[PDB]
Design a binder for this molecule. Structure first.
Ligand SMILES: O=c1cc(O)n([C@@H]2O[C@H](COP(=O)(O)O)[C@@H](O)[C@H]2O)c(=O)[nH]1
Ligand SMILES: O=c1cc(O)n([C@@H]2O[C@H](COP(=O)(O)O)[C@@H](O)[C@H]2O)c(=O)[nH]1
Ligand code: PRO
Ligand code: PRO
Lengths: 257, 257
């Protein structure tokens, strides 16, 4: 009884940020999240503009942007609105609730002011979510919980993964899904986003491991692929993004049947 | 066969950053780390100057400083050198190795340029440490691994804690100890730093739980207490720091016997 992205966007318990995302995924035929892991604002913005039509989401690491300003993020929002994609700051909040609330709202990045989505590790216990939601619920934001990781030696397995799913399902007013390698929740209101994706087999020299779009979307049941170097290190990033988009989209279609 | 801090500073396998810390702890009779969880640079610097003689370490969250600049960190270094304490940026790196290397060296904070110590969660596997050490070893820095957390529902227990200890003991050229609630390693070359500390019982409304200096240093065998609100929310932060310093130091002495 698997529903399309467009039908999932209408589910009774859907979060509004998840619904917006699912609707634009269906409209644009994309379940690709670009991992824009660059250090220059101009490159970030040029990628966002050119690849915007091909992506459902742009994932940032603003803390690696050498020339971050809030006005860069204003320009990114313009592109996100134009091309219709969400902005996901991959901050991996991972502290006690009292600390993460300040890290999300404040400092020089003011993440909550521009990021539709953020994510959190579950290791601190549910206070990490409660602290973020003090800021994010008034701002109509969503959060993803890290239930599994792609890297060698990941401890996000077994009972840890189960705890992440329970934490999400108990904070569904704010948590909209997971970073995971596979479908971890049986509730269709939750999004599954999977990093560690390339077309070719392999990894990196610092513990990254890759699986293909067909494997992660088609076999493992995830919704969205997160792709960094498979796109950004290519010469033609637009054609690379299109290859990843077509791969992930067809894997999704074939699995709906 | 418990050694004093000053003797631990001479151990054959000691890391140079740990040795520097242990020597100044012994010299100054302090095993207190101030958690300087403030949003203004002037308050950060005024606390560092006034409390510097009372502390072995100042723990920052630079991502909550509304008016961060690199020149603020230059002024903090001056105070750290004057008063003899280490600077610990509590960034909780928690990503794949390729990402954390960039988050540690780069962006607007350039953490590795000013922080003696950083810390990491072990959930990604050991690539998190390998990525950080690509930057931190050339810069003669150290790292702490988060083996336990103070907050309600923490998943850093059992086999997760054991994995953190193994990861530290296999990366001892860079990892100098732990964030933990107790002694987790039997190797005296590793430092144990414990947050979730107040003189009075209680917690916060976002999952923080407190234990006393006597409990954590004296019974649970930790080395250093990390104290935020128990000091910073007090009217007289200097006298508060002195009360925490005296508590932690006496608990350490009584346990050496
Ligand atoms: O398990 C995880 C979780 C992540 O967010 N990531 C992130 O996804 C991206 C992967 O990038 P790449 O495709 O270049 O390996 C990085 O930004 C990384 O921080 C990951 O690789 N694995
Ligand atoms: O297990 C942990 C790990 C931490 O670093 N911390 C940090 O230690 C400090 C605790 O502050 P406080 O004493 O105000 O509760 C915070 O900066 C928090 O981020 C913690 O409380 N528990
Ligand atoms: O792992 C494999 O064999 C295939 C080849 C390309 C990606 N997956
Ligand atoms: O928990 C208790 O009872 C004591 C009282 C102060 C701190 N510890």
């Amino acid at each position: 009884m698997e529903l399309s992205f467009g039908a999932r966007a209408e589910l009774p318990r859907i979060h509004p940020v998840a619904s917006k995302l699912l609707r634009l995924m269906q409209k644009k035929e994309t379940n690709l999240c670009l991992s824009a892991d660059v250090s220059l604002a101009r490159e970030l913005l040029q990628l966002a503009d050119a690849l915007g039509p091909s992506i459902c989401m742009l994932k940032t690491h603003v803390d690696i942007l050498n020339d971050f300003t809030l006005d860069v993020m204003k320009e990114l929002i313009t592109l996100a609105k134009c091309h219709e994609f969400l902005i996901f700051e991959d901050r991996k909040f991972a502290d006690i609730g009292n600390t993460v609330k300040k890290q999300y709202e404040g400092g020089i990045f003011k993440i909550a002011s521009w990021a539709d989505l953020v994510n959190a590790h579950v290791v601190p216990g549910s206070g990490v979510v409660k602290g973020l939601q003090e800021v994010g619920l008034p701002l109509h934001r969503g959060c993803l919980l890290i239930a599994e990781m792609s890297s060698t030696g990941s401890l996000a397995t077994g009972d840890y993964t189960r705890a992440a799913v329970r934490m999400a399902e108990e904070h569904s007013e704010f948590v909209v899904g997971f970073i995971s390698g596979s479908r971890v929740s049986m509730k269709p209101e939750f999004l599954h986003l999977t990093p560690g994706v390339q077309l070719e087999a392999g990894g990196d020299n610092l513990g990254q491991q890759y699986n293909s779009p067909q494997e992660v979307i088609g076999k493992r049941g995830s919704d969205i692929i997160i792709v960094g170097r498979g796109i950004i290190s290519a010469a033609d990033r637009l054609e690379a993004a299109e290859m990843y988009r077509k791969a992930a989209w067809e894997a999704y279609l074939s699995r709906l049947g």
